[PDB]
Amino acid sequence: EYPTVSEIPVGEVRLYQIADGVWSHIATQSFDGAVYPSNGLIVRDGDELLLIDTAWGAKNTAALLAEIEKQIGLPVTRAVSTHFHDDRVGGVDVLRAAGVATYASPSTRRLAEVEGNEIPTHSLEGLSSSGDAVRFGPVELFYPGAAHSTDNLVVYVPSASVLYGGCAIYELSRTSAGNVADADLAEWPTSIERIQQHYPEAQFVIPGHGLPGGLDLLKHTTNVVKAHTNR
Numbered sequence: 307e308y309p310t311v312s313e314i315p316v317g318e319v320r321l322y323q324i325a326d327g328v329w330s331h332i333a334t335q336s337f338d339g340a341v342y343p344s345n346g347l348i349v350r351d352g353d354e355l356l357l358i359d360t361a362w363g364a365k366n367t368a369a370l371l372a373e374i375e376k377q378i379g380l381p382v383t384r385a386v387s388t389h390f391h392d393d394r395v396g397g398v399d400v401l402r403a404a405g406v407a408t409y410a411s412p413s414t415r416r417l418a419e420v421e422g423n424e425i426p427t428h429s430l431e432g433l434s435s436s437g438d439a440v441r442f443g444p445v446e447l448f449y450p451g452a453a454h455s456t457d458n459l460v461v462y463v464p465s466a467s468v469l470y471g472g473c474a475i476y477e478l479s480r481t482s483a484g485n486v487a488d489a490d491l492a493e494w495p496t497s498i499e500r501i502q503q504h505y506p507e508a509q510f511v512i513p514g515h516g517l518p519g520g521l522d523l524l525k526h527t528t529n530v531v532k533a534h535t536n537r
């Protein structure tokens with residue numbers, strides 16, 4: 307089964323193989339008095355690995371690299387952070403020191419610098435307008451518009467029909483909004499509609515935090531965001 311928040315100690319990282327050459331990575335972090343799970347993605351790219359998002363902190367991200375070496379044994383050569391918050395760029399310095407080329411959109415890099423978060427080194431061009439898509443090796447990167455943050459990207463793995471929604475997509479067990487301080491609530495449903503229209507074939511949808519599902523996670527997130535909008 308998919309590992310849940312209460313069975314991962316803070317500091318440990320679990321890997322979940324979704325398909326040949328596609329994994330999620332799952333870590334936990336304590337925030338504001340609670341413990342949260344957090345997901346990212348690993349995609350095999352020939353003899354190398356592409357990493358999507360850190361494991362939420364330098365300590366977790368070091369453990370992430372250790373678990374990848376243990377369970378996969380291929381080198382992580384590039385990493386993409388899907389927005390500027392610490393569950394996505396926290397650990398970029400660890401990755402850079404290990405020889406990983408770290409990437410984010412110019413928007414994410416700008417917002418990380420303002421916030422004082424770690425800044426991925428390389429820039430992802432071609433993603434500044436809502437609906438923009440670019441290929442990045444074995445994945446497609448998609449900017450759906452502002453949602454959880456103004457810079458959030460989603461990631462699609464065509465070989466496996468895996469859609470990583472990042473923090474713009476909520477797991478089912480989350481029925482209230484949570485951290486929307488940086489969100490565009492007015493645009494978030496429209497941005498989710500763009501995801502649906504661009505990846506209607508997705509079979510395996512991974513939220514930023516918690517259990518994967520199908521495309522029903524998009525409807526779920528829209529429902530939850532609209533309820534927050536109305537209260």
Ligand SMILES: O=C(O)c1nccn1C1CCC1
Binds near residue numbers: 454
């Ligand atoms: O909503 C998120 O994407 C997130 N990431 C880290 C922490 N959070 C919030 C705060 C309650 C869940």
Ligand SMILES: [Zn+2]
Binds near residue numbers: 389391454455473
């Ligand atoms: Zn965030």
Ligand SMILES: [Zn+2]
Binds near residue numbers: 391393473514515
């Ligand atoms: Zn998050």
Ligand SMILES: [Zn+2]
Binds near residue numbers: 526
């Ligand atoms: Zn729901």
